């Protein structure tokens, strides 16, 4: 997961 907290 990529900051600030998005699911990839």
The percent range for strand residues is under 5%
Helix content: under 10%
By DSSP (H or I, 4+ residues per run), the number of helices equals: 0
**Which geometry do the CA atoms define?**
elongated
User: For the CA atoms, what is the radius of gyration?
Assistant: 4 Å
Outline the biggest β-sheet.
Answer: none
Structural class: little secondary structure
How many angstroms does the end-to-end distance come to? 5 Å
Q: How many beta-strand elements?
A: 0
Written overview of the protein:
By secondary structure, the protein is mostly loops. It has no helix or strand. The PDB classes it as de novo protein. The entry lists the keywords DE novo protein. The assembly is monomeric.
What is the gist of this entry?
It is classed as de novo protein. With 8 residues, the protein is largely without helices or strands.
Structural topology:
Elements: no helix or strand
Key phrases:
8 residues, little secondary structure, 0% strand, elongated, de novo protein, monomeric, Peptide PG-990
């Amino acid at each position: 997961l990529d900051p600030p907290x998005r699911w990839k």
